[PDB]
Structures are given as C-alpha cells and as structure tokens.
Design an enzyme around this catalytic site. Structure first.
Site, PDB file in Angstrom:
ATOM      1  N   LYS A  10       3.267 -39.200  23.226  1.00  0.00           N
ATOM      2  CA  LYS A  10       3.406 -40.248  24.238  1.00  0.00           C
ATOM      3  C   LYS A  10       2.066 -40.923  24.530  1.00  0.00           C
ATOM      4  O   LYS A  10       0.985 -40.401  24.237  1.00  0.00           O
ATOM      5  CB  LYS A  10       3.969 -39.697  25.545  1.00  0.00           C
ATOM      6  N   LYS A  15      -3.842 -38.927  21.544  1.00  0.00           N
ATOM      7  CA  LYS A  15      -3.717 -39.098  20.096  1.00  0.00           C
ATOM      8  C   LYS A  15      -5.013 -39.586  19.458  1.00  0.00           C
ATOM      9  O   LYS A  15      -5.488 -39.013  18.471  1.00  0.00           O
ATOM     10  CB  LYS A  15      -2.581 -40.064  19.765  1.00  0.00           C
ATOM     11  N   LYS A  41      -2.301 -50.650  21.035  1.00  0.00           N
ATOM     12  CA  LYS A  41      -3.561 -50.583  21.769  1.00  0.00           C
ATOM     13  C   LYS A  41      -4.762 -50.852  20.862  1.00  0.00           C
ATOM     14  O   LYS A  41      -5.774 -51.404  21.313  1.00  0.00           O
ATOM     15  CB  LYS A  41      -3.661 -49.240  22.503  1.00  0.00           C
ATOM     16  N   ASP A 129       6.249 -43.231  22.194  1.00  0.00           N
ATOM     17  CA  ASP A 129       7.148 -43.315  23.350  1.00  0.00           C
ATOM     18  C   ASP A 129       8.531 -43.822  22.988  1.00  0.00           C
ATOM     19  O   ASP A 129       9.483 -43.579  23.739  1.00  0.00           O
ATOM     20  CB  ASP A 129       6.549 -44.240  24.405  1.00  0.00           C
TER      21      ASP A 129
HETATM   22  N1  LIG Z   1      -9.577 -32.973  25.402  1.00  0.00           N
HETATM   23  C1  LIG Z   1      -9.917 -33.996  26.216  1.00  0.00           C
HETATM   24  N2  LIG Z   1     -10.816 -33.828  27.206  1.00  0.00           N
HETATM   25  C2  LIG Z   1     -11.172 -34.845  28.024  1.00  0.00           C
HETATM   26  N3  LIG Z   1     -10.643 -36.072  27.964  1.00  0.00           N
HETATM   27  C3  LIG Z   1      -9.722 -36.369  27.009  1.00  0.00           C
HETATM   28  C4  LIG Z   1      -9.305 -35.330  26.067  1.00  0.00           C
HETATM   29  N4  LIG Z   1      -8.394 -35.892  25.238  1.00  0.00           N
HETATM   30  C5  LIG Z   1      -8.249 -37.183  25.623  1.00  0.00           C
HETATM   31  N5  LIG Z   1      -9.046 -37.461  26.673  1.00  0.00           N
HETATM   32  C6  LIG Z   1      -9.127 -38.763  27.351  1.00  0.00           C
HETATM   33  O1  LIG Z   1      -7.794 -39.183  27.617  1.00  0.00           O
HETATM   34  C7  LIG Z   1      -7.712 -40.607  27.526  1.00  0.00           C
HETATM   35  C8  LIG Z   1      -6.551 -40.976  26.608  1.00  0.00           C
HETATM   36  O2  LIG Z   1      -6.752 -40.435  25.302  1.00  0.00           O
HETATM   37  P1  LIG Z   1      -6.325 -41.253  23.972  1.00  0.00           P
HETATM   38  O3  LIG Z   1      -6.635 -40.397  22.784  1.00  0.00           O
HETATM   39  O4  LIG Z   1      -6.855 -42.656  24.060  1.00  0.00           O
HETATM   40  O5  LIG Z   1      -4.724 -41.267  24.175  1.00  0.00           O
HETATM   41  P2  LIG Z   1      -3.597 -42.031  23.279  1.00  0.00           P
HETATM   42  O6  LIG Z   1      -4.275 -42.479  22.019  1.00  0.00           O
HETATM   43  O7  LIG Z   1      -2.555 -40.936  23.049  1.00  0.00           O
HETATM   44  O8  LIG Z   1      -3.057 -43.167  24.088  1.00  0.00           O
HETATM   45  C9  LIG Z   1      -9.037 -41.078  26.969  1.00  0.00           C
HETATM   46  O9  LIG Z   1      -9.857 -41.568  28.046  1.00  0.00           O
HETATM   47  C10 LIG Z   1      -9.675 -39.831  26.427  1.00  0.00           C
HETATM   48  O10 LIG Z   1     -11.096 -39.874  26.483  1.00  0.00           O
HETATM   49 MG   LIG Z   2      -4.528 -44.267  21.082  1.00  0.00          MG
END
Ligand SMILES: Nc1ncnc2c1ncn2[C@@H]1O[C@H](COP(=O)(O)OP(=O)(O)O)[C@@H](O)[C@H]1O
Ligand SMILES: [Mg+2]
Ligand SMILES: Nc1ncnc2c1ncn2[C@@H]1O[C@H](COP(=O)(O)OP(=O)(O)O)[C@@H](O)[C@H]1O
Ligand code: SF4
Ligand code: SF4
Ligand SMILES: [Mg+2]
EC number: 1.18.6.1
Lengths: 274, 274
Positions: A10, A15, A41, A129
């Site tokens: 999600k 990811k 995104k 999602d």
């Molecule tokens: N293990 C972690 N510890 C701290 N922050 C994290 C961790 N994993 C993700 N984040 C933070 O969560 C937010 C969303 O992560 P992201 O990988 O961009 O999600 P997605 O790609 O699934 O939309 C980002 O700001 C990222 O830095």
């Molecule tokens: Mg992403």
C-alpha cells in the site's frame, strides 16, 4: 540468468525506501541491478540518483514525439553502485488510467534491449492499493516472477498484502509469478514481527525480514541518499544488508493462500495490536 | 435541497471511521443521511449497521441476474440514527478496473430514486490512492459537490490530498465539484495541526477539523459501532460532533491550487515533522 522481482504494497508503507536500500546493498555486494519505477509518485529512483526524482518515460516520450523516438541510452540513468534507474510515469489525476504508463514503460524496456544478460536483478516498485491496469501488468503478463510485499501490523497494509496475493492466485494458471515473501516495515509496535510472521504462514510464504523504524532513513533521504551510501556503518545499513542477503538466498516462491477478512481480524486481535 | 459530499484520501488514513462517525453525529442532530461506499474494501457502512460489512451492489446484482432485477428497498439498509447505507463493491484483484462498481452503483441509485427529497446529506467514501476510473467518477460526473480530504502529516497523505485536488481542478470547467476542506486525522505528532493548516492555505481551502488519535475508536469498532453510539459522552464523540457542525456550517468551496513536490517537501521541513 536474471531474477525479476517486484515490490508491492500500500501507499506510504515503505516500498521505495526499502527497494532502493535493498538494491544499494545488492550493488555493494557486486550485483548488477536495475530499478523500474511503477508508481505514479515517480520518486522510486531518487535515492540512487541523488536527485529530486527522475523524468518519466511518459514525459520523455511526449517531448520526443513517440516512444520510438526515445533511445534507451537517453532514458536509463545510473547512480550509486552502477544501479540503473527508470521511471514509468503515468497520466495526471483524473485523466485516464493511473497505471497506463507502466505498460508503455515495460514494453519499451523489453523492445529496446534493457534486459541485458549481465543484469542480476530487476526490481519493479509497484503501487499496490489497487490491483488493476498497469499495476497488475507485472503479475498478469509474467514480468516479475518474485513478488515481495512490504507491509506492517496496520490492518490496511495486511489487507493490501492479501489483495496482491489474490492477484497472484488469479494468474497462476500461466506464467510463473509467485509470492516470495513479506517484508515487515516496522511501525515500532509490540508483537508486530510475530503478527507478520503469522500472516505470512497463513498465506503460505515467510517474513523474509523485519525492517526496524530508524530515523537515519530520514537523515539519509533529506540528502537524497540510501542509508547504505549515507552511513555504511549504521545499524540500519546492516538491516538492509540482511534483507538483501536473504532475498539473494531465497528459494521459497509459492502460489499463496489468500485469507478472509475474518482471519485478518483474528490475527489483529490475537497479537494485541488493537 | 440535499448536500452531496465525498470523503477522499489515501488508504488507511481514516476515511470510513471519520465518515461514519461524522454521519452518526449528523443523525444525532436530526439530519437524514445516506452513505455510499466507493472503496473496494467495502466496510464503509459496518459501524452504522452493527455488521461485519454489507453485501455490495456488484455481489447483489450478480445473484439477481442484472442490476435491473435489484430493488432499491432490498439494497439500502438503515442503521444507527436511520442512516441509510449501501456499498458499491468492485471486481476481484487482477480482474478489470477496481473502480468499475462505483459507476454501476451510483447510476443504480440515481435511476431507482435513492436521492429522495427528504435526505439532507449524501456522503461517498472514496478510495483516493489513484484518481481514475470509478474513483474519479464522483468528480468527473459532478456527483459530489463538496470534497473533504482526510489526511495527516504523513507525506503520502499530503501527496494524495494534492492529487485529489488536481483531479478537482481538471474538471472545474463543468459541474460544480469543489474542495470543501482538509480533515487532519492525527498521527499524534507535533505541529501536525499547523502543518495541515498550512497545506490547506496553500491549496486555498481550510483545515475544517483536527481529529485526535483516540483509543476509544478501536474499542467502539471492535463492537461494530461509531464512537457516537458506543460512548456518547466520550471526548472523541464531541470531536466528531464539532466536525459535523463545521461541515453543516461550511460555506467555503473552492477550486483548489495544487502545489509542487518542492512545496510539499518545504512544508514537511518547516514543521519539523521529518
Ligand atoms: N524503516 C524505516 N525507518 C524510517 N522511516 C522509513 C522507513 N521506511 C520508510 N520510511 C519513511 O516512510 C516514508 C514512506 O516511504 P516510501 O518508501 O516512500 O513509501 P512508498 O514508496 O511505499 O509510498 C518515507 O518518508 C520514508 O523515508
Ligand atoms: Mg514509492
Ligand atoms: N481518530 C482515530 N483514532 C484512533 N484510531 C483511528 C482514528 N481514525 C481511524 N482510526 C483507525 O484507523 C484504521 C483505518 O481507518 P479507516 O477509516 O478504516 O481508513 P480508510 O477507510 O481511509 O482506509 C481503523 O482501524 C480505524 O479504527
Ligand atoms: S482503477 Fe484506475 S482506471 Fe481502473
Ligand atoms: S488504475 Fe485501476 S484499471 Fe486503471
Ligand atoms: Mg475505508
């Protein structure tokens, strides 16, 4: 040989942070990797490229005229550890199907020879999602044989994992797309590892790694960097190295057993998350 | 007159909990409301109906043969405070367009006379991670004049709010769909209210209410209940009453001003959320 992997889950679950850090760890090991961004995104490669983001195939084809006027060598960009990076892009909100750029991008990469024999891994970073349109294409058209789902103890993240698993089952009569594991991206809640282990067991897979919540991620990403590059000595860097090693060594690729909402709620109740 | 409102936002942000509690507060005030679930999760009415979920129009039309064989009086179900409830449903993951049930459901409700003059409000609870297909239909086809976006200080939730706002802008040449406000569903982080107020100001709207994080929500929902019904004296019940009152009294409905990723990141940096 090359292993084609997709990271689903999600929105906001982790990811892109998990994929780019995992891939940086693979590159640090000596693997040749390419990342294909399949999320509108379109910031799935910024930490490898030290960049704001990356211009997308949809954007770049529009400026060139046709996707045929694009050259692969103009599109793929290499960053940390030689990792190659591309972004699909997608139409603007309210315009057509949000996943349509994924189909164009993957077909372009295939026709233009991006899947060179020297690659060890391809990772698709895919919005999860909804499982439809171009977002389902890596599963429907047999592009990613190994699906890893990033989730957490959040009900919505587990529901998404179950929905992705239903998509894998639907297409199991053809191709070889399989569920390779769950990756728990911690919310720093109690018994969260046990919860995701239990969910994986019900689906027939495994929890391949529990990624801790760690502020070094934010400090690295403010500087447009993976933790692997930003602070190679950080505890969290070793966590991503452990995930990468277990992905390399993983041999369990299953047709999953999706569960009911009743079973999801029972899991949540058991592990005291609520 | 009746006000048609839609609640959008990323998955897991609090759309269904906020909508059902807001609507229960409206019913407690004497308003006649119907909730139309437009999320494939299809649990947008369970707290009004005291139920596991609700069988969907897609499911019910399949058993009846055609949507024409369905009767409205068999489909709409009334729960707490007389609130009327329906779920669109959607195809299984990997099968067709995840939003296709929303189009079928809204058209069915219109043809069968569900929009009776006695209704004061209709609330659509809409998946917002992609703005396309049936999920865009309430905006594209002018079904919900007042869009309220549930978000939080999470970057992904703010990004979703910005994407929904881009969809509203795209269709502003026709119809009267407008952004009515942001609802901050708290992550219990510092300066989160100020962050969402600032985001609303950049978009041209307002933060209509800051909903606190409160465990009474989980205790109510374990019992399939809104907080309004479960514990009418709870602090959180009064929070939903305040949101409902401000929705009733709201007169600001704008064509929003979507922002850049640069502005989103600047907001996050300013309010120390990172
Ligand atoms: N293990 C972690 N510890 C701290 N922050 C994290 C961790 N994993 C993700 N984040 C933070 O969560 C937010 C969303 O992560 P992201 O990988 O961009 O999600 P997605 O790609 O699934 O939309 C980002 O700001 C990222 O830095
Ligand atoms: Mg992403
Ligand atoms: N203000 C709140 N306080 C405590 N828990 C909340 C609050 N709002 C939502 N939740 C919880 O968050 C989870 C997701 O909310 P939900 O409304 O189902 O999200 P969505 O409909 O956007 O997917 C639910 O378990 C819900 O009980
Ligand atoms: S869900 Fe997006 S277009 Fe079908
Ligand atoms: S995104 Fe779902 S079908 Fe177009
Ligand atoms: Mg919901």
């Amino acid at each position: 040989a090359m292993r084609q992997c997709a990271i689903y889950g999600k929105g906001g679950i982790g990811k892109s942070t998990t994929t780019q850090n995992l891939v940086a760890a693979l590159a640090e090991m000596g693997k040749k990797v390419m990342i294909v961004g399949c999320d509108p995104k379109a910031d799935s490669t910024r930490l490898i490229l030290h960049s704001k983001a990356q211009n997308t195939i949809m954007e770049m084809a529009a400026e060139a005229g046709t996707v045929e006027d694009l050259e692969l060598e103009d599109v793929l960009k290499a960053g940390y550890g030689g990792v190659k990076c591309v972004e699909s892009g997608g139409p603007e909100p309210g315009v057509g199907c949000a996943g349509r750029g994924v189909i164009t991008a993957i077909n372009f990469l295939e026709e233009e020879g991006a899947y060179e024999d020297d690659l060890d891994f391809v990772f698709y970073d895919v919005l999860g999602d909804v499982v439809c349109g171009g977002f389902a294409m890596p599963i429907r058209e047999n592009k990613a044989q190994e699906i890893y789902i990033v989730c957490s103890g959040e009900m919505m993240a587990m529901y998404a994992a179950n929905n992705i698993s239903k998509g894998i089952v639907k297409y199991a009569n053809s191709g070889s797309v399989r569920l390779g594991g769950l990756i728990c991206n911690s919310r720093n809640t109690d018994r969260e590892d046990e919860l995701i282990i239990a969910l994986a067991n019900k689906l027939g897979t495994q929890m391949i790694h529990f990624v801790p919540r760690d502020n070094v991620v934010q400090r690295a990403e403010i500087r447009r960097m993976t933790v692997i590059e930003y602070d190679p000595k950080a505890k969290q860097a070793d966590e991503y190295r452990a995930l990468a090693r277990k992905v390399v060594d993983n041999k369990l690729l299953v047709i999953p057993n999706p569960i009911t909402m009743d079973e999801l709620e029972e899991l949540l109740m058991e592990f005291g998350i609520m």
